Every structure is written in C-alpha cells, then in structure tokens.
C-alpha cells in the first residue's frame, strides 16, 4: 500500500500517466489497510438516563443513573 500510494504521487515527475490496473491494485491495497485500521466506536449512555429498579442499587455499585463519563476506577485519584 505504501509503495503504491507513493508511486501514484511521484509519477508526474517522469510525466508517465498511471494505468487502470495499477489504480485498481492501489485501491485494493489501500482498502485492505483501511480494514486493518478500523475502530468503530460505540454509543455511550447519555448521563441522565435512569438505571432500572431491577439493577439493585443501594446494594450494588450502581447508582440511580448512568455516569455519562468514564466512571471512577480507584478513589485515590477521584477527580477523573
């Protein structure tokens, strides 16, 4: 992928136009790199959305409502 994308960029200097086969090969290589470098993040809760009564708050760690931010992990560092 790196070599193909470089070839397309530097071909103007020798004034050689690219071929459709080269373009297709570069496209497939770049698409494979794109597949390798995906993240697809998820949708966190809003923050004022209530937690159900069946989640057993006042006994479990859960509160009435979702945190809406990364929840506290330690307590020694409570600001974040």
């Amino acid at each position: 992928a790196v070599g193909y994308q470089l070839l397309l960029r530097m071909l103007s200097d020798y004034s050689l136009e690219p071929t459709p086969q080269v373009l297709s090969n570069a496209q497939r290589s770049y698409d494979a790199l794109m597949t390798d470098t995906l993240v697809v993040p998820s949708m966190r809760r809003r923050g004022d959305f209530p937690v159900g009564q069946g989640n057993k708050y006042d006994v479990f760690t859960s509160d009435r409502y979702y945190p809406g931010d990364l929840p506290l992990i330690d307590g020694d560092i409570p600001n974040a």
């Binding site: 330690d74 020694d76 560092i77 409570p78 600001n79």
Partner: protein, 53 residues
C-alpha cells in the same frame, strides 16, 4: 492522635503517602511507704509516760 493534611490542585493522593497511626500512653506507678514508728518500755510507760494520746 494528630493528623496532617495534603494540598493538591485537583485531589490526587495516589503518588503520595498517607498518615500513620502511632499510639502512645502515659503510665503511673506506686511510690514508697510513708511510715512513722515509735517505741517505749514498760517501766517508762508505767512511771513517766502520761497523756500519751
């Protein structure tokens, strides 16, 4: 007991250390007898000793 406080810009105590709980005591002990003793002879109390109380 006595304690000391931390001062942080945002409330981080993970790096630092906490307070220790050292316990001390004050002890009291017994002293010595304060004793006073007297003695006198039978003939002495028979002739000379009067108003002993």
């Amino acid at each position: 007991h006595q304690f000391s406080s931390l001062r942080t810009p945002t409330g981080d105590i993970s790096g630092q250390n906490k307070n220790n709980l050292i316990s001390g005591k004050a002890t009291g002990r017994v002293g010595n007898y304060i004793t006073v003793a007297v003695e006198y002879q039978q003939l002495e109390e028979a002739i000379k000793l009067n108003q002993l109380e």
